[PDB]
Amino acid sequence: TLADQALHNNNVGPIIRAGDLVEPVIETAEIDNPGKEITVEDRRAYVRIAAEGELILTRKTLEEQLGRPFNMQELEINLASFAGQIQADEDQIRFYFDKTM
Amino acid sequence: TLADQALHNNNVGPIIRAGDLVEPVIETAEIDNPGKEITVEDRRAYVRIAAEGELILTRKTLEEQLGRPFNMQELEINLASFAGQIQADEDQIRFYFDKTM
Amino acid sequence: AMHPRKDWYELTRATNWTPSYVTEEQLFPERMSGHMGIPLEKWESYDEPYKTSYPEYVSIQREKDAGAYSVKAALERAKIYENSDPGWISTLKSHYGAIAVGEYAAVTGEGRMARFSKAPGNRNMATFGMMDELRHGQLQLFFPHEYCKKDRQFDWAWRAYHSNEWAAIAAKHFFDDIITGRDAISVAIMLTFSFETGFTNMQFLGLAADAAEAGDYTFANLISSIQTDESRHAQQGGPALQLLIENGKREEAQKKVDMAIWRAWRLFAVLTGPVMDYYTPLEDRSQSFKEFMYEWIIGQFERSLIDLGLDKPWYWDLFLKDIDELHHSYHMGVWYWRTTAWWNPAAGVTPEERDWLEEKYPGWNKRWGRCWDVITENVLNDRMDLVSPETLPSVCNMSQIPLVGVPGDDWNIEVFSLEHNGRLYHFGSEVDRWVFQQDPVQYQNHMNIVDRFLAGQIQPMTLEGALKYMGFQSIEEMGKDAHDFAWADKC
Amino acid sequence: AMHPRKDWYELTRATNWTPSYVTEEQLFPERMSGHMGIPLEKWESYDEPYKTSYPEYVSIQREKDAGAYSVKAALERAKIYENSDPGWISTLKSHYGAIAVGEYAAVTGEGRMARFSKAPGNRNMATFGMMDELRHGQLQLFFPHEYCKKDRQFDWAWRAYHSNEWAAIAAKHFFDDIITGRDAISVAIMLTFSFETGFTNMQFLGLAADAAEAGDYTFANLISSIQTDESRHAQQGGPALQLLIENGKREEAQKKVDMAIWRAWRLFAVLTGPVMDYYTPLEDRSQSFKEFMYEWIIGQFERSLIDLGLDKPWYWDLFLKDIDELHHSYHMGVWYWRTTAWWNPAAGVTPEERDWLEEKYPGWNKRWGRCWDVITENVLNDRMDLVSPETLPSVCNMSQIPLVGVPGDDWNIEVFSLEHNGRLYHFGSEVDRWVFQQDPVQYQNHMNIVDRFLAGQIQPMTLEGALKYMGFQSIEEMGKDAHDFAWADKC
Amino acid sequence: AFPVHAAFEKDFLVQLVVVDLNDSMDQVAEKVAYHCVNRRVAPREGVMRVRKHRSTELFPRDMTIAESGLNPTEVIDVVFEE
Amino acid sequence: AFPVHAAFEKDFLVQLVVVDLNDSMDQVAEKVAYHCVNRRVAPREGVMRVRKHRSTELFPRDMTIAESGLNPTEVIDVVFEE
Amino acid sequence: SKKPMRTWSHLAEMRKKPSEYDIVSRKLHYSTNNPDSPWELSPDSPMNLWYKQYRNASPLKHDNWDAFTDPDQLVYRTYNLMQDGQESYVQSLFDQFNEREHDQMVREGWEHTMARCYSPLRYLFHCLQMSSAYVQQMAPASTISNCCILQTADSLRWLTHTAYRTHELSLTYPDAGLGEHERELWEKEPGWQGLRELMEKQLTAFDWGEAFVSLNLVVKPMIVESIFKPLQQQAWENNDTLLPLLIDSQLKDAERHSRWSKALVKHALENPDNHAVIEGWIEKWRPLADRAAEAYLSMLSSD
Amino acid sequence: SKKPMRTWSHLAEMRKKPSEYDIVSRKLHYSTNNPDSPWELSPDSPMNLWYKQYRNASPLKHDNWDAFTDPDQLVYRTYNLMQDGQESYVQSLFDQFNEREHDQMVREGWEHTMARCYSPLRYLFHCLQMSSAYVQQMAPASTISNCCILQTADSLRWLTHTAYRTHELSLTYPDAGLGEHERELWEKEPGWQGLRELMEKQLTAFDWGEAFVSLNLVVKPMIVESIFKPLQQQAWENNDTLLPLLIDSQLKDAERHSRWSKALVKHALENPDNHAVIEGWIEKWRPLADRAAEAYLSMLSSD
Numbered sequence A, B: 001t002l003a004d005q006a007l008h009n010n011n012v013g014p015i016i017r018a019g020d021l022v023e024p025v026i027e028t029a030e031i032d033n034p035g036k037e038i039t040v041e042d043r044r045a046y047v048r049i050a051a052e053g054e055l056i057l058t059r060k061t062l063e064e065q066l067g068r069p070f071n072m073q074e075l076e077i078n079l080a081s082f083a084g085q086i087q088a089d090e091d092q093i094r095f096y097f098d099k100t101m
Numbered sequence C, D: 001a002m003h004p005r006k007d008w009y010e011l012t013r014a015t016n017w018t019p020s021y022v023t024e025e026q027l028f029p030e031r032m033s034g035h036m037g038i039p040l041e042k043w044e045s046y047d048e049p050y051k052t053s054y055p056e057y058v059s060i061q062r063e064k065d066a067g068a069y070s071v072k073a074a075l076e077r078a079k080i081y082e083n084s085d086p087g088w089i090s091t092l093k094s095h096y097g098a099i100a101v102g103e104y105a106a107v108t109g110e111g112r113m114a115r116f117s118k119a120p121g122n123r124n125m126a127t128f129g130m131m132d133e134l135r136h137g138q139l140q141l142f143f144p145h146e147y148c149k150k151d152r153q154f155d156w157a158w159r160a161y162h163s164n165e166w167a168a169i170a171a172k173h174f175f176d177d178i179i180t181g182r183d184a185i186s187v188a189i190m191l192t193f194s195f196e197t198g199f200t201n202m203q204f205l206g207l208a209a210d211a212a213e214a215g216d217y218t219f220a221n222l223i224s225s226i227q228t229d230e231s232r233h234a235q236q237g238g239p240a241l242q243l244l245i246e247n248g249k250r251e252e253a254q255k256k257v258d259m260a261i262w263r264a265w266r267l268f269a270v271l272t273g274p275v276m277d278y279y280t281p282l283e284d285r286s287q288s289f290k291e292f293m294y295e296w297i298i299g300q301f302e303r304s305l306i307d308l309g310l311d312k313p314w315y316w317d318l319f320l321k322d323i324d325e326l327h328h329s330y331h332m333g334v335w336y337w338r339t340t341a342w343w344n345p346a347a348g349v350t351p352e353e354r355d356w357l358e359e360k361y362p363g364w365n366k367r368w369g370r371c372w373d374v375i376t377e378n379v380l381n382d383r384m385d386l387v388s389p390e391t392l393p394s395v396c397n398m399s400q401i402p403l404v405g406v407p408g409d410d411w412n413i414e415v416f417s418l419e420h421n422g423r424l425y426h427f428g429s430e431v432d433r434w435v436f437q438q439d440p441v442q443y444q445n446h447m448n449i450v451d452r453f454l455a456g457q458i459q460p461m462t463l464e465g466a467l468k469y470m471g472f473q474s475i476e477e478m479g480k481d482a483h484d485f486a487w488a489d490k491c
Numbered sequence E, F: 001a002f003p004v005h006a007a008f009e010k011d012f013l014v015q016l017v018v019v020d021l022n023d024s025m026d027q028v029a030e031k032v033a034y035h036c037v038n039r040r041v042a043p044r045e046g047v048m049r050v051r052k053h054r055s056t057e058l059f060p061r062d063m064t065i066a067e068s069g070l071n072p073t074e075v076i077d078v079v080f081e082e
Numbered sequence G, H: 001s002k003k004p005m006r007t008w009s010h011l012a013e014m015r016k017k018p019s020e021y022d023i024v025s026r027k028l029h030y031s032t033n034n035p036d037s038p039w040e041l042s043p044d045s046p047m048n049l050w051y052k053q054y055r056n057a058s059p060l061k062h063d064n065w066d067a068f069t070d071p072d073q074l075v076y077r078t079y080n081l082m083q084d085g086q087e088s089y090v091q092s093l094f095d096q097f098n099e100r101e102h103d104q105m106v107r108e109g110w111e112h113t114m115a116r117c118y119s120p121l122r123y124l125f126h127c128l129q130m131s132s133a134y135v136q137q138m139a140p141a142s143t144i145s146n147c148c149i150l151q152t153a154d155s156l157r158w159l160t161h162t163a164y165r166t167h168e169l170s171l172t173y174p175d176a177g178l179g180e181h182e183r184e185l186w187e188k189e190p191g192w193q194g195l196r197e198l199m200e201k202q203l204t205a206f207d208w209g210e211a212f213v214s215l216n217l218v219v220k221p222m223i224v225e226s227i228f229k230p231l232q233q234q235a236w237e238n239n240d241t242l243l244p245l246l247i248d249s250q251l252k253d254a255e256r257h258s259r260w261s262k263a264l265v266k267h268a269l270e271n272p273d274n275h276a277v278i279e280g281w282i283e284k285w286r287p288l289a290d291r292a293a294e295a296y297l298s299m300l301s302s303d
């Protein structure tokens, strides 16, 4: 029951450590996945950010929400974990599942 | 009285902001001015370190007390103030007074 | 102009070649490589999904450390040590002791892959992996070093892995099994996939939440920074697993994952479970240990496992039940035998805590609470001899932890035993016995500390001789009640 | 190999030349340069004792900011804003408001020297000076910006200097006098020597101590980092003073130092004095304001002044007496007129504080305490109309602050007035009147806010019309009792 | 309208008080007291008097501001008879 | 010297207890209780019995460990008669 | 009656999230609020008269100077990150070329060309430093002044390059007057006299608009095209492979100064009257600039 | 009975204040505490047998390996500070030389020499990376393993240089087999066969002592003297001015690897028996190394 329900989820997305990337990434996730609901759980040291099936962060939108020049690879200074498989390049990172549970 | 006594001092030396330079600088001041008494006042955000008339910090001794490669010019990341005139070079900084009060 | 990474990345991993002057098997021997007979050419399709490259790496890792050290420097005078609840300080002591030199051991699992993996992209990511674990080993010696001058049990950040202390031996049995003791592909599967994407989040992020609530940002900042490297080098495991599955090796892959998850589980239950539900002050418990398990292991990690094409492990229902029960008994064991630990366990059973425990674990008071009732009375009536043990707990032959069960109103305890090769072994679960049987040559002549005690290797053969054996050199180093029993005044 | 700085440093400041196509005086006009007729060749012996160079500068300043921002980022969730005493939050509000855009103004004092000083070493150090004040202006807009969304009075970090609010006008009268309004050598003497080696230590280090005690490390870390730049560019002033003295200008040098010290003093007494002795929670008062004055101004700065060959200023005994008395009356003024401030003054007169004040300032209760007794009773008996003013305080024509004195059992108050050029001016000390008389063209047609009120420029000519005049746009922006009077429950 | 600046006995500052051309010093004194007594200064018995700031002579109580020759924005003290 | 591992009824673990070759199950039971009752387990009335771990048959009370055929380091349960 | 905002009131009424640059750079000169007194002093104090005359009364006019934007959007923090990477690169070049004994291998006599034509550049660059600081302190918007501040620092950077290399070169060639004779050359050598006459006059153009146009639209483009690039060509012909790399780093800065300059001109030309003001100052200064270039080039390629 | 110490118990009994390097680097292999089982497992598990045979039974012996000290005393933090400055310098060189179209100006045919002799270096450097990681995991002291870790990272650095430049060069010369034919050359070209035979054999020397001597005292010095330096000379003759600067940066790393290597040998020779062990391994490998050098050089300077 408890275990079952917790397992049948398709939540994907970044876990961001406390710091200056938390709000920009939340705002980026909202902007770049229009008509997904973004969920956010705040555990003070980190924030768990998720969407169903797929969540995209583009460099361009994250730089705009952050307010300063930003390269996609730098996200790892603050990406402490993530749910989903990850596909990452110079332009965006995508968290996604192959399967639907 | 109060003002007078506070004014007739020949105390010279660095005021170090809170951080990883506080103890190495105290220990350096002791080592590099043998037979001066080093005085230390701890105000939590900063530490006032002094000797009479002259206080020398050598790069070599400060690197040894700090435990890692150190260049004299870097001391300004943590030198928040100082008493005395200052004479600084690649090898040491000297805090000193021309006059004796 | 500079050319973007996607245009030259493939050349960085075009490094496989057909050997001629030695054979392929001489160059990649199976006992170190673990390639299971899969030819070289099949490994070339390995594609690490979390890439980096050398110029980016040194630049971004430089910036990660600048922040970690700057924050530590700016907070040295915030009197965490002196003002923190002693249960929090013990959390710091067990963490640094159980982990610092285990990080440095992980360099060798990554070096194993860097040399012996037939996947070129793995060999390069393992090379950043080596660098990362070096970072983590050095951070977590440097950060506690400060504290040696306050408290000799902070010496155990360095000393633990050189000791025969029982929890150090459980740490080393586990890391030597899944990190330093097996071939490259076993490391990829057991360490980078099973341990590093599943369980370490509990200790480096779950516990960071608690540290943040406790006002200890040096530590929360540090361990969450560390986990950002993990997030990258742990992604070496999925593509190896995918390759094994595509080349006919799903069953062998599954068995390695099953084993590593369970080995990791019994170790986190004795280290992190007590920290989260007892040592961490009540008001800093962001979530219960079980809630964090359901978030990090059931909700995030088991779902990732499913997505890569593997099955839930066969013992999944044993596991769920264990999350409800096991660490409560390990905490009791660690606390009753506190004198054998290098930290100071907090009892964590004031009435207000017991209410929380009862909320987080309905039925707790009629179970573990029955034992704590006996303990708490002894303390009130100043019968301190009933609060210290005069014998050894029976220790597991797999995970090296005591054999435990549910106490109180529905007492249930089971030992799973095995005769093998003229010897009698005891395991604390069905799964532990099964792990042993997957690879007896790995374990069969290992002797746990109780084995050693009964065979004559611990002199004198007394609880005190065992204390000295475990490396303790003064009464101050051995563990004590964290609050020196002041919790009983609240009872 | 690289050559060490001492071998090429002299060439970096070998930049004076003899002009031919314009005259020296056209190139360095006295009204912008302030060279007092001293020829070009004499300035070449100027030797900045705290050197830096461009490669070192960008490298080390990069590392200073990395730490400042990293610490701020790691602590954003420590709930300082929500958990701090409201007196501490008001300290942050007055600090950022009174200072951020004044830092950016200091860029222009440094640019004044960078272009118009005849000393080449000064022109280069002024160029790093420009860079430093830019840093400080940007830090102290960036750091409070976070907080706009919590509290509109944090908008005043940016807005204050664009307002006619009376304390903003006192800030601007002072900085425009000693930073942006005078020739290069006056800047060197009044700003870098008198202000920057003497008084700013009170606000960027004295107050950092208090911030550290308050558990606000973001802020303590920030402002102490800032002061490390100050320590370097402030050393432009001593060698100019030494040069003036060697070329026959000691008297003019002395008069500039005397003036700048006193102008700075009356401004710190209204900003820092209340912060240190009233707004900062009692338990975070590292030292009293007067103790910090004796450490930073009498003990450190006056002794440095003596060492360079100058005299104590003529008003030194007025000054000592003022340290005992003045800020207690400025605090009372700011708090009774709190609705004209953009922060929320704390009264700071609980019995426990009054005991501290009495210890730090024997006789306080029979003086200011007499007024606070009347105020405190009104509050207990809920007579809130007696706790808000219905008129304007009489404002100074030099420092733009109200005219005050010692109240209570030995009431003493004096106004020093002056008729000049068909107008009547009022000064709050002998020294303020003397400053005016040193340079009347600088001040004579300036109109303080009460002048403006009485001449018709404030409509309506009511306390409310003056509140709107000062830039306040909602009741929430105007200052209130920090604890909304809950301190009276302790009385 | 006659702006003076006034310092009330045992108070901590000088304040702008707008009195009238034809006020007696007695009324001037009430108007300044308004902004002082029971706000920062404790009431007391006695006859409130007006004098030019720091001076040793009181204005007569009946005297008017205009009778007095005071100029606008000059400073006055309000004090109690010895 | 005869090392067994023993699990006491309502206790939370298994402990090493060194009993004697010639002990009755009654004495074995006392020796294990020593490390259990009043430490983590509340005293109670009734007859303490010894059985091989998880088994359904009690050893007779008079029986000795050597009479019993138990091997060293085997697991026993100490429990109260139904 | 109102409520907290997410940013400064002046940035509040725009759609986009304020950037770092916006937050810390915009509308910071309060000295432009009161036309009758720039500074909070007597309305005719000397510095108030100075600003009223040389800023407020410039014929170069715009009703929203503060709306100017650095096309690079640099702040102190990002200038130093950038320049620490470029300067750390130039210092590594210095160190490696020194290790390789680069200087001994230049063509016969090149040290004399350096001593005449290169090392006295420290005077010229210092003049650009002084002049940039003047535009900083006079400009009518903080976003404009901020570009000048950085430009002032870049000019010191170039000056410092030149000082280091003058000294270093003298260590291989100690008899060419390197580090000894530059002031004389600046004052008396015919090839330096056009430049010096240009800079002395430019440094006494006190109108903020004329200072900016003459410095950034006439003087500095002339230095790129008539001093930097021909010195690179001359080094190529004399087997000086360090100098072209150094000047390429300096040209990076120069091209940045030119970018913000053109952006300011674009901002200025929103006012149609401003096009004849800018052009007349360009015509006014261009002949001094051209003479300065020709005299230098004749020196450079002379015997 | 005792009391808190200022440092780890193992560092406590020395006069000097422990450095960063000491605190974070020393005596971290617990796998050397129990000679009969390195690893906390069955004493004859496979990896325990492996270590007993290839570490513990090495004839290269010392009773205090842990006392070894990196003469550079590098830790992770200071390696990255250093290498970020050197690598940021090499990337700026890449960017500026590309801006200048350096590659088009090399001498006719030089692209073919690069495609044959330079770009297949990625195989060689990767072999050095693999081999360094092996010495890391076998070495009997953490201070030794730490030097190997950094050496492994430097080898990847060189590999990555080579990959970037192979790709970049192919953009100017798309018909030379650059980025297409390196594996074939490595496997089949006669000039690559000595090296490849050397590395394949070296990578199966599993004794930790022999691995270290053959890699760091024979193979890597041969690459400096027979591959790096002659490639710099060849680039000089073909108007490739980038490659000599790049290789100078790589040589910096190589000279660091050589420094810690000699320091380890100095530590080893405190045991007089160790001098015949080291020398015999040097004699054993030197002929494969010399053959490898000669075959490469013949390729390099052939037609």
Ligand SMILES: [Fe+3]
Pocket (backbone or CB within 6 Å): C103, C106, C132, C133, C136, C230
């Ligand atoms: Fe790790």
Ligand SMILES: [Fe+3]
Pocket (backbone or CB within 6 Å): C106, C133, C196, C230, C233
């Ligand atoms: Fe890891």
Ligand SMILES: [Fe+3]
Pocket (backbone or CB within 6 Å): D103, D106, D132, D133, D136, D230
């Ligand atoms: Fe400043």
Ligand SMILES: [Fe+3]
Pocket (backbone or CB within 6 Å): D106, D133, D196, D230, D233
């Ligand atoms: Fe300053």
